[PDB]
Amino acid sequence: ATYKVTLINGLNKTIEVPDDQYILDAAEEAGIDLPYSCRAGACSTCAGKLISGTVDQSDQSFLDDDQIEAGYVLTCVAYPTSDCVIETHKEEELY
Ligand code: FES
């Protein structure tokens, strides 16, 4: 499957993401400059907030159960599992 991932912050664009591609990688192929540092699921730099839809970010490690429950997603290690809508650049909300 290929899912429509809407990325919002002067950013408002919907990209196509195969279910076996990470959202950050797909955003970069679409020319979108999203924040990152480790690209390995171990920090908050690439954090976004899921507004609708679902992801598989099982390779992540930084976010705790409670941050995941609140809708945070580490875009560098997140695969879409449905069409979804993500607010980007959300690291600041964790602190
Ligand atoms: S850039 Fe570090 S977790 Fe995504």
The closest of 85, 84, 80 to 18, measured between CA atoms, is 80
Pairing of strands 2-8, 84-87: parallel
SS3 call for 93 = helix
Pairing of strands 12-18, 2-8: antiparallel
Q: How many CA atoms lie within 13 A of 95 on its CB side?
A: 7
* Listed resolution, Å: 1.2
The answer to whether the CB of 25 is under 6 A from ligand 1 is no
The closest of 82, 79, 77, 53 to 63, measured between CA atoms, is 77
Beta-bridge partners for 38: none
CATH of domain 1-95: 3.10.20.30
The answer to whether the CB of 58 is under 6 A from ligand 1 is no
Q: How many CA atoms lie within 13 A of 22 on its CB side?
A: 19
Q: What residues does each domain of the chain span?
A: 1-95
- The answer to whether 51 and 85 are in contact (CB under 8 A) is yes
Cα(67) to ligand 1 centroid in Å equals 15
In angstroms, the CA 34 to CA 89 distance is 7
Which contiguous run of DSSP H or E holds residue 28?
helix 23-29
Beta-bridge partners for 7: 13, 86
Which contiguous run of DSSP H or E holds residue 69?
helix 65-69
Cα(37) to ligand 1 centroid in Å equals 6
